[PDB]
Amino acid sequence: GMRKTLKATLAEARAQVEAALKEEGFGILTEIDVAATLKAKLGLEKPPYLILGACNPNLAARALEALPEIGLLLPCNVVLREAEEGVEVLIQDPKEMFRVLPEATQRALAPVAEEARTRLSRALSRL
Amino acid sequence: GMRKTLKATLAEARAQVEAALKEEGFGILTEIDVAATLKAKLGLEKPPYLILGACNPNLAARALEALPEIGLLLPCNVVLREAEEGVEVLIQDPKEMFRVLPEATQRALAPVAEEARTRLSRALSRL
Numbered sequence: 592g593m594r595k596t597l598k599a600t601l602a603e604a605r606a607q608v609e610a611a612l613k614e615e616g617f618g619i620l621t622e623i624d625v626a627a628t629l630k631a632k633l634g635l636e637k638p639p640y641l642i643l644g645a646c647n648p649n650l651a652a653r654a655l656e657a658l659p660e661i662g663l664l665l666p667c668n669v670v671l672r673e674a675e676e677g678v679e680v681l682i683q684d685p686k687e688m689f690r691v692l693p694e695a696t697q698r699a700l701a702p703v704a705e706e707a708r709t710r711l712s713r714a715l716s717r718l
Numbered sequence: 719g720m721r722k723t724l725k726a727t728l729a730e731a732r733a734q735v736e737a738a739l740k741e742e743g744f745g746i747l748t749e750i751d752v753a754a755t756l757k758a759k760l761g762l763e764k765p766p767y768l769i770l771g772a773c774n775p776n777l778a779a780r781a782l783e784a785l786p787e788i789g790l791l792l793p794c795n796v797v798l799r800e801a802e803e804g805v806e807v808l809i810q811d812p813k814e815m816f817r818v819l820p821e822a823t824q825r826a827l828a829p830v831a832e833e834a835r836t837r838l839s840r841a842l843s844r845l
């Protein structure tokens with residue numbers, strides 16, 4: 592949806608992502624190293640793949656105040672994975688993620704999802 | 719969907735939900751204290767609210783083979799929140815989550831989602 596490949600090492604891509612997100616009000620709350628946890632649990636050897644859970648507290652608080660169960664679809668995931676041409680960054684589109692909800696609830700959340708999507712697409716565009 | 723209210727405290731509910739998930743092959747990879755992070759960032763007191771990222775490594779590994787970009791949807795969120803009549807546990811239903819995905823990936827993903835959902839609803843039933 593929002594996808595970009597960077598010619599950058601993993602650590603470089605990850606620092607540039609954290610920095611572009613922080614410019615737009617999104618902090619990183621969680622991180623899962625998917626290759627390291629598949630190794631530890633299953634003995635599998637997979638290429639680099641991280642999932643970062645990023646969040647703007649103001650937009651999150653607003654969404655959770657309107658619809659408390661919306662925590663099931665937070666935070667916004669950012670994937671960084673090894674690609675041929677370097678590291679691919681993928682960012683969850685909030686508008687797309689709210690489509691699991693009834694249409695009336697998506698209307699009720701639209702201003703927040705739009706604001707989040709605009710800040711996220713801005714971060715991506717600066718990578 | 720998938721919710722139960724526990725006549726219990728938040729730490730009784732957390733110790734308990736983690737035990738019931740473990741029984742069903744789901745471990746907790748991440749956790750966000752929503753009330754403490756919104757207080758920290760925004761200065762507002764909010765009611766107890768936790769987001770636990772639960773994962774079964776074998777099911778996640780197969781999901782990632784069907785669709786490499788499914789890391790944007792993982793792991794499976796479990797909410798514990800102060801509710802009206804106790805602490806409400808909500809579990810993201812894998813079947814609903816996958817609906818956001820391209821039509822083309824749905825059939826291949828259906829049996830991993832069915833297996834996840836049966837394990838989760840089992841864990842929820844034992845609380």
Ligand SMILES: O=S([O-])[O-]
Nearest residue numbers: 615616647649650
């Ligand atoms: O960071 S403030 O702009 O939500």
